[PDB]
Amino acid sequence: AVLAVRREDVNAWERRAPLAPKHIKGITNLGYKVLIQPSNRRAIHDKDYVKAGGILQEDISEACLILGVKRPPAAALMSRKTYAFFSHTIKAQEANMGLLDEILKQEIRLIDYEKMVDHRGVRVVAFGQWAGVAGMINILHGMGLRLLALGHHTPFMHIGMAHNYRNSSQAVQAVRDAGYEISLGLMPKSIGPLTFVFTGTGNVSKGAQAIFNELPCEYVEPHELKEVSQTGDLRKVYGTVLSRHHHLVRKTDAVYDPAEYDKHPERYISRFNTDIAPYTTCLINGIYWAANTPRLLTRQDAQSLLAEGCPALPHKLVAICDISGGSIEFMTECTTIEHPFCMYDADQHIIHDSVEGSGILMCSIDNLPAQLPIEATECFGDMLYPYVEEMILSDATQPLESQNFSPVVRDAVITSNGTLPDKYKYIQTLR
Amino acid sequence: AVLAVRREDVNAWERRAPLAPKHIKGITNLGYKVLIQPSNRRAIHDKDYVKAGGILQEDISEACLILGVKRPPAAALMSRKTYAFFSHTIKAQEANMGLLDEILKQEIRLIDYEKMVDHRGVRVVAFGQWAGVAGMINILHGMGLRLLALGHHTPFMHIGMAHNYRNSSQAVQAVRDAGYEISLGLMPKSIGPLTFVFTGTGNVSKGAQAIFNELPCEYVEPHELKEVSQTGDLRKVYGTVLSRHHHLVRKTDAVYDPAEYDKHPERYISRFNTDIAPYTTCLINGIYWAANTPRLLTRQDAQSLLAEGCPALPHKLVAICDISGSIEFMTECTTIEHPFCMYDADQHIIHDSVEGSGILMCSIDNLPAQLPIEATECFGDMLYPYVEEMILSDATQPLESQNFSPVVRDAVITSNGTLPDKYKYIQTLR
Ligand SMILES: [Mg+2]
């Protein structure tokens, strides 16, 4: 019963860990030995895990359970062990198919965080609200550069990228300082009031709203967005939270039924393109798109939206940041931490790593919580902590049926004893 | 006698102004009318100039003197006026030749800030130390990214670009906070102590040292860098200021004579490549290169410099930042948008990258634009005493009848319709 936290080596920006020092202290209190593989890449220093009771050691062959965040290289895999990380093999991705064979060859039991769900189907291990926190900092930083490219200096120029701040607290202070300048009237008058639209009910939307609340903000209802976009006070920023009933209407009767939409989303359409989009400066998209869910904006909608010293904006919509996705059809490509922003012009072509031109600024980062890795690590570790003890007690050599697993851990096992279970047998047929 | 401050439209990053509101208040106190062309690009808001006494007006045809920072577009030029900006036509630059003839056609008097000098030859109007302040913030930000690409999370990751901060004070707070983490021991042990070398005696070198003083720094002599580079405390950063006598020696006897080096720099060489460079993590170059001054580093010197969970640095030298020809292998310059480039052992430069085994290099032509408010106040303070004589000038009257000081007078490039004798060579140089 020995636990090891492996070093992340997927990419340079993976500074997170599956467990935080306070979680390691709890595991050592239960009587389990925890090995910590040294890593200069992790945002939490090795000395903090030593204080919690972990042992700094390169050789983690002693451990039967190896915890990581992202996929490990094939050569690093140790045979006859239990590994837990994000495999991204659920859709039989070719890149991770070379990894999957080594796990089967080494007779490794693999638990995937993404498959861990409760009885209602909600994932029980995730990074919480921090993707929204990081997304809001980035999009405010991107709007400063985009507005400067259009010729307007704004206080948003004084907000850096999310990864430029030690933690969310230091970023909050920077947001307040830029907000102070806005309340002082340092915004350019010709661009008009700025309106922020938040979509979704998940934790990422609340995290994005938390950063927004540090600005001089006033929340208005969606139907008021038309009014505020023209007569709003320039010493404030305006925000609105989009709910289902605000924009979803039936194709037949334009009626919204909460129970019917959840069971039958194919019968509904979205009025976001005409009711909200023309009066939106910045869209923060947190909607988790499901089967037959209507899209907020289409390529046809973008064509409608895209048409001396102090010029006005060419179009009201400046930027869109998705913090959770198919909701926006013309957002076909994703950005990275290194190149956070791209432009979608009226010619329906994407200019990557640019804030210039007449297009719409777009931001779509797949690993937003990596920009706030310390706070993301504690949040992830809090969710994973209750399931850790049953994972350490697992034995990679014994069959799955003899293991004392809960349904959350059991259904998440992709590989075990060299062979894929029935529920994941389909992977082999999918290339 | 009407003065106007034109709107900057050279590039998106030109947020500076030739005069600050506090300077406009003094000019209005003298009784002169000041027009302010509205500009969303300016870092200082239009209302602050209105408070100082300026008048917000798009049409500045009433003014006889138009002050800007950088070049205006040719179409915007108003005939029979006096303009003051950086023209960059003294060396007959191809790009600005189309501007220069247009100025001659409009019969405009052009004063160039860079040509304004004192009797000793020192420029009297400049942006001061702020280029060095911005350069130090950027290079610390670049070292965090470069070290992360090498596999090391560092507190330098928590320092942004200069243009991400409202002023130098907010940047100082971030540098202090990263310094706190260094003093707490959060730096990775495997990379070892970090050594910073500052060169030059100009104002920009002093500005970069000011940001460095906010870190947990210990200053050592340049020759001590060899010892500290191995046994230095990992909770401190180490810096040294390079003087002439430390690295400059004559070829024949290895002796340094201050008076002779100034008169005959060709007789001297620099051993910085062997005595200090191998033990330098980050080089901040502020030396102003002269005719026969020896080079600090050569391409062959770079070839000599370029050769499990906690890896060591591939080579001691990580980054070089130029804040001012001293370094030949720095053949290309970077921009604010793409601040860093890598010079590899293959002698090819990969721009906008912090990855690979090369040497990270940063060389921005307009560093003060990242701190435009403080750069505007410094530039305006130097220009303010010469402003009044420019307002009294008349573009239609001959240059010889104008009451100009020698500083302003020699800086007139175009005068009335034809270039003066001192600038006659420009047309023949094309
Ligand atoms: Mg970049």
Residue numbers in the entry:
A (entry chain D): 24 to 330, 340 to 356, 360 to 466
B (entry chain A): 24 to 330, 340 to 356, 361 to 466
What do the authors report?
Therefore, to obtain an LOR structure of a protein that maintained catalytic activity, we focused on the longer construct (amino acids 21–470). This initial construct crystallized readily but did not diffract well; therefore, we introduced five surface mutations to induce better packing. The longer construct crystallized in a new space group as a tetramer. (b) Tetrameric structure of the long LOR constructs shown the four monomers assembling into a compact sphere. Each monomer is very similar to the short construct with a root-mean-square deviation (RMSD) of 0.5691 Å2 between the most similar chains. According to the PISA server, the average dimer interface of the longer construct is 1810 Å2 with a predicted ΔG of −6 kcal mol−1. At a structural level, the C-terminus of the longer construct forms an alpha helix that penetrates into the active site of the adjacent monomer. One hypothesis is that the C-terminus interacts with the catalytic residues of an adjacent monomer with the enzyme active only in an oligomeric state. In the structure of the long construct, we see electron density at the interface of these loops from two different monomers that sit between Asp 388 sidechains from each monomer and Glu 373 carbonyl backbones from each monomer. We have assigned this density to a magnesium ion which could help neutralize the negative charge from the aspartates.
